[PDB]
C-alpha cells in the first residue's frame, strides 16, 4: 500500500495562484491541505500515525515553507524561461514499504523527477528543462532535505500509519448487484450494476461471452466503489468480501 503525496498548483496569471494537496495511503485518502488552510487537516483519526505530537509540528512547518517557496519559485521560473501563463504543475511524491519516488509534471506532462541525490529530467522533456535542473541542483540544502524525507522519514512514517489504522485498511464490505435495461442499440443492452464493494479490486463479466464491456470503477461517497458491466445482444461477480460466493444474477 503506497503512500502517495499529491499536489496540484494552478497559476492563473502572474498574481493569482492556488496550491492544494492530499495523501493517498493505498486507495484510501488520509490527509488534506488547501491554499486557504494555514495547517494540514486530518481526515481519519489516525493521520498522525506513530509520529509524536512534538514532531508532527515539524512536518507542519516544513510544508508551510515549501508551499510559499514553491509558489515563488515557479513564478520566477516563468520569468526566466519566458513560459506563458497559465501554468499547471502536479507533483507526485511518496514511497512504500523500500523504494521511493518524486515525479513532477508540467501541463500534464512529465518533465523531471528526483532520482538519486538530485534532479534528473525525463526522456521526452523539452530543452528548457535543463535550465531548471541546472538551477534546482544548486540548492544543496533542499536536495539533501528531500533525501532526509524520502529515504528515511517517509518509510518510517508509512510504517507508523499502516499500524495506527489498519482495521480500516483490511476492512471488508459485501456489495449488492442488480440488472437493468439499457438503451437498445433488434439489438438490446444488458447492464449488470454492482455497488458498495471494498476494496477496489473486482471481477465482473457476463458469463464468459466474448463481448462483455466491464466499465470503469466509479467511487462512492462512503469510500466504496461502483461498477457497471454491459453486454450488447447471466452475469457473474466475484469479490474478496463475499468469499467464494460468486454473485450470479439471472436474466430476466
Amino acid at each position, epitope marked *: 500500500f503506497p503512500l502517495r503525496c499529491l499536489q496540484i498548483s494552478s497559476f492563473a496569471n502572474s498574481s493569482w495562484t492556488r496550491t492544494d494537496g492530499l495523501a493517498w495511503l493505498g486507495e484510501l485518502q488520509t490527509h488534506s491541505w488547501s491554499n486557504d488552510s494555514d495547517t494540514v487537516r486530518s481526515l481519519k483519526p489516525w493521520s498522525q500515525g506513530t509520529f509524536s505530537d512534538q514532531q508532527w509540528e515539524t512536518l507542519q512547518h516544513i510544508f508551510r*515553507v515549501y508551499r510559499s*517557496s514553491f509558489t515563488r519559485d515557479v513564478k*520566477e521560473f516563468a*520569468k*526566466m524561461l519566458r513560459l506563458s501563463y497559465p501554468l499547471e504543475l502536479q507533483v507526485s511524491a511518496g514511497c512504500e514499504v523500500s523504494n521511493n519516488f518524486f515525479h513532477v509534471a508540467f501541463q500534464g506532462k512529465d518533465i523531471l523527477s528526483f532520482q538519486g541525490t538530485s534532479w534528473e529530467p525525463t526522456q521526452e522533456a523539452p530543452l528548457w528543462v535543463n535550465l531548471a535542473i541546472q*538551477v534546482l541542483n*544548486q*540548492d*544543496k*540544502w533542499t536536495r539533501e532535505t528531500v533525501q532526509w524525507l524520502l529515504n528515511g522519514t517517509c518509510p518510517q512514517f508509512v510504517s507508523g500509519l499502516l499500524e495506527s489504522g489498519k482495521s480500516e485498511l483490511k476492512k471488508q464490505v459485501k456489495p449488492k448487484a442488480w440488472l437493468s435495461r439499457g438503451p437498445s442499440p433488434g439489438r438490446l443492452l444488458l447492464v449488470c450494476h454492482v455497488s458498495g464493494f471494498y476494496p477496489k479490486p473486482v471481477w465482473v463479466k457476463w458469463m464468459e461471452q466474448q463481448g462483455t464491456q466491464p466499465g470503469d470503477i466509479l467511487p462512492n461517497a462512503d469510500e466504496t466503489w461502483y461498477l457497471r458491466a454491459t453486454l450488447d445482444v447471466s452475469c457473474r461477480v466475484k469479490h474478496s468480501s463475499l468469499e467464494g460466493q460468486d454473485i450470479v444474477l439471472y436474466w430476466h
Partner: T-cell receptor
Amino acid sequence: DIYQTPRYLVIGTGKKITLECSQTMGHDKMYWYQQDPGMELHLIHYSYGVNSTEKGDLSSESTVSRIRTEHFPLTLESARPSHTSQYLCASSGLRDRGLYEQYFGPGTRLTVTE
Amino acid sequence: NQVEQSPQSLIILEGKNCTLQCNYTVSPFSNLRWYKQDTGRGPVSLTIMTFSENTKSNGRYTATLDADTKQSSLHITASQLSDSASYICVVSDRGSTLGRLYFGRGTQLTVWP
C-alpha cells in the same frame, strides 16, 4: 574577474550613455545597482543569462542587453541631471565554498551636465 | 525593509574594537553576507555564513550568526584608520541563484586618530 570601463564618465544631456560591464568566469547571473554617495544600493536590472533581462527594484529609464554570457552593458535612452549617480555591476557564482557568492564590479561614476 | 542594521553611523578612535549589528526578518533564511565598501569603490565580501554556523574570521574581522534570534554582528578587531568604510549586511533567501537578495542600508564607520 568582473571589470567595468570606464571608471569615470562625463557626458552631456540628451545623449545616450552606455556602460560597459564584462566578466571572464562563466557566470550566468549578473546584476546592476545604482548608488548615490551616502545612500544605499538599489537594484535596477538583473539577468539569469543570455537574452534574459529583468527589471529590479527601482523603475529606471535604463535598459540592459544580455546577448553574450561575458557581457552585460547598461544603456540610457536619454540622459538627464537626475540620472547622475554611481553604477555598480555584480555577478553570482560558485566561489571557494559550496555557496553562490556575489562579486562586485569596480564601479563607474557618472556625471550629466547641461 | 526586512533587513534592519544598527547603528546608522558611528565614529570611533583607532586601536579600539567595535561591534556592528544586523537584524533581519527575512524567511526562509539560507545564507548571510557582510560587505565592506570604501568610499568610491565597490563592496568586497568579508564573510558569508549559513544558519548552522555562528562565527567566521577574516583576519581582523569576525562576524557571528545568532540564527535563532535572527541577528548577526561583525566584530572589527583592533580598528585602524583603514577600516573607515561602509559595512553592508545582505541576506539571501535561497540556496541557489533563484533567490532574492536583501540589502541593509549599511553602517557608516569612521575611525579617528
